[PDB]
Amino acid sequence: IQAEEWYFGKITRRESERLLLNAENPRGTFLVRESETTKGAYCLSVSDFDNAKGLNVKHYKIRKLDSGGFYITSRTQFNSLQQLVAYYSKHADGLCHRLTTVCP
Amino acid sequence: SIQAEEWYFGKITRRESERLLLNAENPRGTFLVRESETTKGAYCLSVSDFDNAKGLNVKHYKIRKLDSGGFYITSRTQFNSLQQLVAYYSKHADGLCHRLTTVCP
């Protein structure tokens, strides 16, 4: 997945929030990183805006099933990470915002 | 002035640096220096590498600016300038994934 624009590898949770939390960035700017402590998991980081908290980053753990697939909820699972990203770019389904822009 | 150095790419993002380095045309050890996007005062050395499992991949090493003037990536050597840092690791990888071979174009 190294070659996917949205994959930032092993940046920490804090570093993903420093990258994402920028006022030039739209709601739904996102990146995927390898989870910092859970081994074999990915994490989807999405900026979001709430009146109160202002801009903040939500983090959703992505698990990989034994057969290979990926999921965030029981609603949909994906044969690959790129399919998950493609799906959520069009359908938020429970995430805070549709994935609009890859982290610059 | 570091602004006009050919291997200095200023404020480009971590993501744009990889888009530049991760390209078939570039030898292992193609590099660029840039500012850290979020560590103030630090710089960053981005280097292309090739691992059969990863494929072509970029490694990023932070460069800290000593208060007293220098620059360093490890406790083994410190340098007075970024120029001198690039030159040294062009000869000796000394912990880096690869010697700095090619300035990124």
Architecture of the structural domain at A1-104: 2-Layer Sandwich (3.30)
Whole-angstrom distance, CA of residue B57 vs CA of residue A84? 23
Tokens at A68, concatenated: 């290979």
DSSP B31-86: EEEEE-SSSTT-EEEEEEEEETTTEEEEEEEEEEE-TTS-EEEETTEEESSHHHHH
Provide the experimental method for this PDB entry. Answer: X-ray
Partner residues linked to B58 by β-bridges:
B48
Whole-angstrom distance, CA of residue A58 vs CA of residue A60? 7
Rg of chain B, C-alpha, whole Å: 13
> Which of B12, B15, B22, B26 is the best mutation test for A, with the most CBs of A within 10 A?
B15
Tokens at A62, concatenated: 């992505």
Q: Are B73 and B62 in contact (CB under 8 A)?
A: yes
Residue B97 CB neighbours (<10 A): 16
Residue B69 CB neighbours (<10 A): 10
Architecture of the structural domain at B1-105: 2-Layer Sandwich (3.30)
Which among A64, A63, A47 has a CA at the least distance from the CA of A55?
A: A47
Residue B12 CB neighbours (<10 A): 18
**Inter-chain CB proximity A104 and B15 less than 8 Å:** yes
Whole-angstrom distance, CA of residue A54 vs CA of residue A23? 10
Give residue limits of the domains in chain B: 1-105
Which of B15, B38, B56 is closest, CB to CB, to A18? Answer: B38
- The residue of chain B nearest to residue A103, with distances taken between CA atoms, is B15
Resolution of the structure in the document, Å: 2.2
- The residue of chain A nearest to residue B13, with distances taken between CA atoms, is A104
Which among B24, B21, B19 has a CA at the least distance from the CA of B7?
A: B21
Rg of chain A, C-alpha, whole Å: 13
